[model samples]
Target: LVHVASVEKGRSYEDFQKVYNAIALKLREDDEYDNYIGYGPVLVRLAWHISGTWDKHDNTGGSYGGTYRFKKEFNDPSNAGLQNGFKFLEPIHKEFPWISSGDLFSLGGVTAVQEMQGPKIPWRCGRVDTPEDTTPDNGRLPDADKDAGYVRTFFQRLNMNDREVVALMGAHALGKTHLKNSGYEGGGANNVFTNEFYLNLLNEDWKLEKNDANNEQWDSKSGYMMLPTDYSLIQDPKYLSIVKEYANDQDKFFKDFSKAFEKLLENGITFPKDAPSPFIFKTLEEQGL
Candidate 1:
């Protein structure tokens, strides 16, 4: 045996697998919200927002803390609707009582993406739960009302480059931007959870019209949604190339998304190479237990 240096002891593979099954089972049973869009997209958005808070320079914030458990982060205006995703995970946590709140929330996000055919996001335990004061401020997340420049500047604090930003925004394909959530409505249509974000970008003419209900954002005929920052992909020549590339190839999107997402989840953690390969947790029916 080798000397193992660590802080908090992590959950075993079997325990995490159990946690996965709990999430999977619930996902199968709950099917009424958003035309069976279910909790998957919301979870994806949650994970994105959580991980997107990282700052590379100081290494201060990121998914590593699981700070969304606090109100400051929870009540963050950008994260308005994410409470639904939290509620969805609550029962699963009760079922698997040993999992850390941090791990459970992050794993819910990981499970959602994989089950929806997105990517294999590796996870680790040991995010010590901190109090509300430790929670990062609301503005730590992105602004839906801003343009590409604002989006770029915002992500810089999180250590995401232009390519990573483009890939991550691809998640808009999964969940729509609700008017109540961000004062932007109908940002996603037919929430089937696919790599259609890129396709929607290239295929549609995008006649920019303000939403009648909330005159906060512009949208178009693609039956897809774009935040001001999202449209900035085309606005900036460099970002647009990657956007177009993903549009033409779904396989490329899957591969790039997987790589980028794994990186996203691991933003603030330092894992050893001997650390296990990404876990591929089975859905509930897949286990039959």
Candidate 2:
């Protein structure tokens, strides 16, 4: 199943920018969700979940087909709460029906990071939707009830390395994980993107406890929580060092996260020779909007 980039006929960066601007503005307007945490984080999580489905061996599952729109993928237990992100983008897609589902889904993530004060995730378009059969089996995504060894091996399927995995996990700082959505729950409830995930990992006093969902998680005195995988950052020697580095260097963390996130979003698509450079959209704050 070779999925090559096909730019939506006659559309260009200006059109993609329209989608980006709309996503940014509505994020501002929809501040009441998630105890006022906003839609930015869920949009990003949606984007990551879509792309993380990819497997490098065959590249069957990924963001390219936008297959998450299908019944099977949408109903995925892993995708439980992502419909909120999809619903938020529905009107934007309705306005610009020309943009492929893959583009809109991935673009929501890019816009989310930038608008939420995270790094600039440069995104390109041209992912065409494919048939429902192309949807990967559910459970392609990583689970939270795991350790560093599982984390490392799982990402290898996606062809991501230790640093790349660590960088992408920086996105963990963006939002709280709802128990209804994922078995793990209650991050700092932060929507802004920062190196705080790493900061919390390195600095917090964590205790292993079962949450209301009856799952094991590392709890902090500050009322924050981390997945077994998140806590694994400090447990593993290699990841611990990287986590410490990110916690200490904010700019480096941001830059690395941006690069890794773009790579994750673009994993399975084949861009043609003339595809435009990745478009870095203006943040709503930067535009004075």
Counting clashing residue pairs in each candidate, in order, gives 0, 0
Residue lDDT tens for model 1, 96-180: 7766666677788888877776655666655555555656676677766677788888877766788888888788888676777
**Alpha-carbon deviation at 88 in model 1, angstroms:** 0.6
**TM-score quality measure for candidate 1:** 0.89
> Which residue runs does candidate 2 get wrong by more than 4 Å?
none
* Clash tally for model 2: 0
Q: What lDDT, from 0 to 1, does candidate 2 have?
A: 0.90
Each candidate: RMSD to true structure? 3.5, 0.9
Give the TM-scores of the predictions, in the order they appear: 0.89, 0.98
lDDT of 2 by residue, 1-289 (tens): 6788998999888888888999999999999998999999999999999999999998889999999999999999999899999999999998989999999999999999999888888898899999988888998998889899999999998888999999999888877888888877787778888889898888889999999999999999897888898889889999999999999999999899988889999998888888888888888888889
Error (Å) of candidate 1 at residue 232 is 0.8
Scanning candidate 2 in windows of ten residues, the lowest lDDT window is: 180-189
Q: Which residue pairs show collisions in model 2?
A: none
Candidates' C-alpha lDDT: 0.73, 0.90
